[PDB]
Design an enzyme around this catalytic site. Structure first.
Site, mmCIF file in Angstrom:
data_model
loop_
_atom_site.group_PDB
_atom_site.id
_atom_site.type_symbol
_atom_site.label_atom_id
_atom_site.label_comp_id
_atom_site.label_asym_id
_atom_site.label_seq_id
_atom_site.Cartn_x
_atom_site.Cartn_y
_atom_site.Cartn_z
ATOM 1 N N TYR A 111 -0.196 7.925 33.208
ATOM 2 C CA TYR A 111 -1.408 8.472 32.624
ATOM 3 C C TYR A 111 -1.189 8.801 31.152
ATOM 4 C CZ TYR A 111 0.729 13.122 33.193
ATOM 5 O OH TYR A 111 1.560 14.215 33.129
ATOM 6 N N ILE B 222 -6.703 16.749 39.824
ATOM 7 C CA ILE B 222 -8.092 17.164 39.676
ATOM 8 C C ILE B 222 -9.011 16.136 40.323
ATOM 9 C CG2 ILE B 222 -7.607 18.484 37.598
ATOM 10 C CD1 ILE B 222 -8.709 16.074 36.017
ATOM 11 N N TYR C 58 -12.691 20.974 34.310
ATOM 12 C CA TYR C 58 -12.477 22.246 33.626
ATOM 13 C C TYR C 58 -13.686 22.779 32.865
ATOM 14 C CZ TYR C 58 -7.462 21.622 34.499
ATOM 15 O OH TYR C 58 -6.233 21.450 35.094
#
Length: 107
Positions: free
Chosen positions: A26, A56, A82
């Site tokens: 990532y 997430i 978030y």
């Protein structure tokens, strides 16, 4: 709001399932902003599994919608990671996230 934008090559058949541990390169990117995270820096490519809500929610749905060797481009909405909260000092509240994801996994 997971939108997959795939750089073509790979197989398109090895789909990750539950109980499978996978390896993802990532790289974090902020919309209209700088970088904030990269697995390419530490080069320990973040061995994680599927089915424990470790990652997430926007990154999780991006995992199962890929295959072996593919190179997608995530666009995570604020409300799934978030946006109401904001990760302290690193991610502001109401932030839309961009990820450079290549799935070179096992299992």
């Amino acid at each position: 709001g997971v939108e997959i934008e795939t750089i073509s090559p790979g197989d398109g058949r090895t789909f990750p399932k539950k109980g499978q541990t996978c390896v993802v390169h990532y790289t974090g990117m902020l919309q209209n902003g700088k970088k904030f995270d990269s697995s390419r820096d530490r080069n320990k490519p973040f061995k994680f599994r599927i089915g424990k809500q470790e990652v997430i929610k926007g990154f999780e749905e991006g995992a199962a919608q890929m295959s072996l060797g593919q190179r997608a481009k995530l666009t995570c909405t604020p409300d799934v990671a978030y946006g109401a909260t904001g990760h302290p000092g690193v991610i502001p509240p109401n932030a839309t996230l961009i990820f450079d994801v290549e799935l070179l996994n096992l299992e």
